[PDB]
From Swiss-Prot:
Ranges annotated as biased composition (Basic and acidic residues): 543-552
Binding site for ATP: 93-100
Protein name per the record: Myosin IE heavy chain
Sequence similarity: Belongs to the TRAFAC class myosin-kinesin ATPase superfamily. Myosin family.
Keywords assigned by UniProt, alphabetized: Actin-binding, ATP-binding, Calmodulin-binding, Motor protein, Myosin, Nucleotide-binding, Repeat
Gene this chain is encoded by: myoE
Signal sequence residues: none
Amino acid sequence: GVPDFVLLNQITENAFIENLTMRHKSDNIYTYIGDVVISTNPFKNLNIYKESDIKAYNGRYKYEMPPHMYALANDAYRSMRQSQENQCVIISGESGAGKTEASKKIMQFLTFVSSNQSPNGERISKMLLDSNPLLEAFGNAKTLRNDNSSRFGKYMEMQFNAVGSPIGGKITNYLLEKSRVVGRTQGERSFHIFYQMLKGLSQSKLDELGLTPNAPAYEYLKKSGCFDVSTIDDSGEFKIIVKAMETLGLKESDQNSIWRILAAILHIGNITFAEAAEQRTGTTTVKVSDTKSLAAAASCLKTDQQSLSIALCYRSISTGVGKRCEVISVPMDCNQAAYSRDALAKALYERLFNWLVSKINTIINCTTEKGPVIGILDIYGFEVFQNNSFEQLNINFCNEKLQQLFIELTLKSEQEEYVREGIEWKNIEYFNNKPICELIEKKPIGLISLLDEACLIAKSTDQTFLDSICKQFEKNPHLQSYVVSKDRSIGDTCFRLKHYAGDVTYDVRGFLDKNKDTLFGDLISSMQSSSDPLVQGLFPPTRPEDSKKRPETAGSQFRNAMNALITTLLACSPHYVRCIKSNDNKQAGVIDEDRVRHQVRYLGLLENVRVRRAGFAGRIEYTRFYNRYKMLCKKTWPSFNGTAKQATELILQQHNIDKEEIRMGKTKVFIRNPTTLFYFEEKRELEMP
């Protein structure tokens, strides 16, 4: 027979893939690895999602029913039930590849288990389940790796009601990709809202916003050079977004309100410059002859057109116990001018979206009870191109922290729990804990510590900055380039950064202005002092979960954002969920060998199969091995003491077997070579006829 996976006729790497393929090819999605979930997203309806199935995975164990509930939860999720404490789940995988449908499993599992009666429960649950595709039409954009690419960090939180159902949850994001608005690769496309909005709204609505049916005319859409996409037809897709607008609770009144922000931005975006070499010598200034663009920019803000340009493009400070008189002038280069221009254009919309989703919950979130919180992680995925750059580093950097997370959990915090119980365990080949990859970019003498430092040294452009890396490193382990590693594939200006997976080379175009992020309190304060129910509203009640002190470069602000992600994950009891994509054609039956094999490769899962386990040939569990050879051993009956370490010893000591002949960890039994299985079968034969 040999069902499932842990009974393969030939326990090898090749057979593992062939089986896993046959599994997914036969509607067997969920798969286990020691005690970790591995699922996929069909992106459509399969006949395995009903009340019967959900009710089935509750009050049982893993070795009783097919893969879905993974006992690790039933144990851990119950381990804290002794302490009535809260949990948190983390999900990783390709961008927009159901991290939307992976959470669905958690929710569908959460309900019923948490619950029922209340007519105002299952009904409002519908609008909540439709909240996923809701937010995937506004903030999401397109990527060459995925179409439904979410463009905002999200750490959801699940609370509960007195009846059982949930009450609500909060949302938190970080950084937000904000270099796509001005720069991107050919073929790709910027945010959806800018294009889907055009091919839809009545021409009458466009003219009111001072718009013309022609992207090239603007700047926001000209910085790229592309306008029409071959695959997308926003003219028809627009009706799908509008159906989501009114259905939830975003009336045209609220819509126009939101558009008044973009209406301004589109009036501010037109502000382009014709390299003004005004200064006889000093530094080329920035002149705006076509003032109606800069005028319309302030018309929406209803601020002094003149003073605005004199108080932003020009920096000013005096000081003396009071708070200065702003007027003195500092015209600067185009790059810094464009930098300041964008710097505001991004953060202005970032705060809004995060405050918008909170107001979306105004007609959803409850405020009756306060209790435990089950968190769900969801962040941008590890994207892969045949040509990387800076914007990739930030995304790839998260994975370096994500791998550190697991090693901190499935290799450190968990191993310490083994010995805390006092059960047989010995440190089996522990591959580098890679804290070097963390120290290489945190404490003094580190990448971002050497990078962000260069971001401020404006006189250190890109070529000089490069030299501050090759010398600082290319000696420390786990980092190569052209010089040391004589490989022509690496340019003299580029370098070779080794992740925990493969190899990646980066360019340098725009590094500084894109990375600096430095946002002083000159572009921020302007809007705050404006007169509009939204302009100041986008800047919500001061200090939301982030106060301390305000005036300081954003270079450190973003550093705090990532630190707020790690510290809160260390001291807790996370849960692991990792998904794999079937194919890039959304086909139900087609398996791309190379692509799938690569995913299993660069994620280092089969290595855990040899580490998390221990590493050898034929493998079997303890839990699953138990309910199979029960009537073949002595003192291994329900009268067991409970102590595994003492139970396993009782299993072998009564049949006279040497200690070192076997190896016992926490889970999974380990007997080297097949012949030894015959040695066991025979040892039992010549002790009692």
